[PDB]
């Protein structure tokens, strides 16, 4: 939810 | 004076602290006796280290231009 999974 | 402020606060600020404090720390003529022995006891409070007279005065001076006016009239 912040780009790369899950950053 | 404003030497305690190191290289902080800029001119005006410390220039004024020094001045005000310079005059504040001067020898002040006691209203009671005449001896130059008045010292600030706190904000607006002054006292003769000689006769012990404790009195109200300026905040940084013992006499304010305004006060000297009262006297007259």
């Amino acid at each position: 939810x912040t780009x790369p999974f899950x950053x | 004076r404003s030497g305690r402020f190191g290289a902080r606060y800029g001119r005006v600020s410390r220039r004024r602290v020094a001045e005000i404090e310079s005059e504040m720390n001067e020898d002040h003529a006691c209203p009671n006796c005449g001896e130059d022995r008045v010292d600030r006891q706190g904000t607006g409070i002054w006292q003769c280290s000689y006769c012990d007279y404790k009195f109200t005065g300026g905040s940084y001076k013992p006499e304010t231009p305004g006060g000297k006016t009262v006297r007259r009239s």
Partner: protein, 237 residues
Amino acid sequence: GRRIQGQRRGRGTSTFRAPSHRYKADLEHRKVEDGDVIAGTVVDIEHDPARSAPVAAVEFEDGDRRLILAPEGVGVGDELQVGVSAEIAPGNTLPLAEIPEGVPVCNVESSPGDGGKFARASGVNAQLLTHDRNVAVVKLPSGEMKRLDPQCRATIGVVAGGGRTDKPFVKAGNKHHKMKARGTKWPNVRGVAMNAVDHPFGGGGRQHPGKPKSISRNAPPGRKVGDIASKRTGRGG
């Protein structure tokens, strides 16, 4: 949105209250049936936390010990007087009627007996100008001509501690300490720096008010911010 800061204020919570429990004395003129025979001796000069100015302790003839809004030049030993016949010297309190015109006065009553209302901050002073069997004209420190009952009592002289505003605070720490002795929330965040939800000026991609700053007097609390009922703004013209 959410109530703006000015709205949390009214609720009178801790953060917004003055540390009253740390205040010394509700400075108010004494009462005298009449005669004026009252007078006491200055016993000490203290620091008044509520006004960052000195106040004088006094013991009266009828053994009454109370703190007094001290004018300048009042020292220990001095003898003050409070009454219609009180002498016309600095420190004494008497009805404007008995005070000579042109004399600087402080701690003036609005209604006779209220114990003083006007001119009580560091070094300020009112000015008695006109006498009359009816009205006593006093020029308050704001420069306004106030029409008062010549029966309103007032103290002679200017308030002590004058010139306190001449020295800058220099550092946040000095404000901090002073602020802590007043009924005020400090420091101050500008609306423009908040979210839209929190203040009418909040929001945007950059910081700026979303409307003209001058608000109508009739505006509801929650929306009355910025320049309240400004008759004009700026320094020009």
